Amino acid sequence: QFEERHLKFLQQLGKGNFGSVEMCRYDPLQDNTGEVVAVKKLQHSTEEHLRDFEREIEILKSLQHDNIVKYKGVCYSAGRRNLKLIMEYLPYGSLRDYLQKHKERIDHIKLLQYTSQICKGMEYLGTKRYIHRDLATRNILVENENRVKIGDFGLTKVLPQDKEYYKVKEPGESPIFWYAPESLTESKFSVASDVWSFGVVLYELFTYIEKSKSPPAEFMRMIGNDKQGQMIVFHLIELLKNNGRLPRPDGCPDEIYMIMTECWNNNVNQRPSFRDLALRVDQIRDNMA
Numbered sequence: 001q002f003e004e005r006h007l008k009f010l011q012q013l014g015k016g017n018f019g020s021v022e023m024c025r026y027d028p029l030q031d032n033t034g035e036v037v038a039v040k041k042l043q044h045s046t047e048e049h050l051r052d053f054e055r056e057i058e059i060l061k062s063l064q065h066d067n068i069v070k071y072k073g074v075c076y077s078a079g080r081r082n083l084k085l086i087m088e089y090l091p092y093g094s095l096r097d098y099l100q101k102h103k104e105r106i107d108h109i110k111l112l113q114y115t116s117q118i119c120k121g122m123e124y125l126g127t128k129r130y131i132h133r134d135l136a137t138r139n140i141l142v143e144n145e146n147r148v149k150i151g152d153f154g155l156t157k158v159l160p161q162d163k164e165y166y167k168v169k170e171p172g173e174s175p176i177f178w179y180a181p182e183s184l185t186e187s188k189f190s191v192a193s194d195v196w197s198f199g200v201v202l203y204e205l206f207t208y209i210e211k212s213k214s215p216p217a218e219f220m221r222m223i224g225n226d227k228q229g230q231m232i233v234f235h236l237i238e239l240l241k242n243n244g245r246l247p248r249p250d251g252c253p254d255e256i257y258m259i260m261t262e263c264w265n266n267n268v269n270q271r272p273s274f275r276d277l278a279l280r281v282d283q284i285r286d287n288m289a
């Protein structure tokens, strides 16, 4: 519905592994009346990458929720190459950088607001039987001081109807420090692995993205910085299956840390649901207020 002719490049907004996102201005009248949108593009167009990008586009088109980034349209050439996804432009960027540059104005009540918003978005994803597979603060965008949104779905898969997990291993490497143990060992991805990752997101939020306190830093100072290559993953595996966990972040109440640890249960069936998480987080936020 968008013609590439009229898309005017302004700057680059974010760079991931198979594509990137540009701030551009859709201005068909050529008078700077058009609106500023975000455009996700591909860095290499294989047909594997093209088919997965199309599946992701149709996934995002099927979503509507106040904590999901808004699909706007598609744009292409010549042909059916150069595929580009148009989305609403969120002007405060990723939650990672926003929180790392405003750490002195975001108290625990606002972090709990963000947390409950993420949980509502994730539950909405689950009702459609989608597995996000990449829940992290770098993948959360900020609409304003009171609203955040899940903003990338490049790894999201739909569950088959007879099973509740999804087995997939991608080429290249993976954000293994957000991954549940069953996703490192058997490549199984489900709602419960998304709950593990959300526990990690909670940890991130309450570290305020301190650089020494990142999950990679903490995990590889727990296993030793001498490990390299595949062995890293291996050691991580055993560390997690001996109940080694990320430490409680500085200033984080024990109620929150216990939510985190309950989402890091090794038994994949003893993890909380996103609705139970939203309930507990809302009750804590109400006790603080």
Ligand SMILES: N#CC[C@H](C1CCCC1)n1cc(-c2nc(Nc3ccc(C4CCNCC4)cc3)nc3[nH]ccc23)cn1
Residues within 6 Å of the ligand: 012, 013, 014, 015, 016, 017, 019, 020, 021, 038, 069, 087, 088, 089, 090, 091, 092, 093, 094, 138, 139, 140, 141, 150, 151, 152
């Ligand atoms: N999730 C997610 C990650 C995703 C990556 C791209 C490919 C995969 C990972 N990624 C999505 C956006 C993005 N950013 C905005 N706003 C916005 C963004 C950045 C700034 C910076 C602030 C400081 N100064 C320089 C600009 C300001 C405003 N809006 C958006 N809509 C849809 C996406 C999107 C950016 N990276």
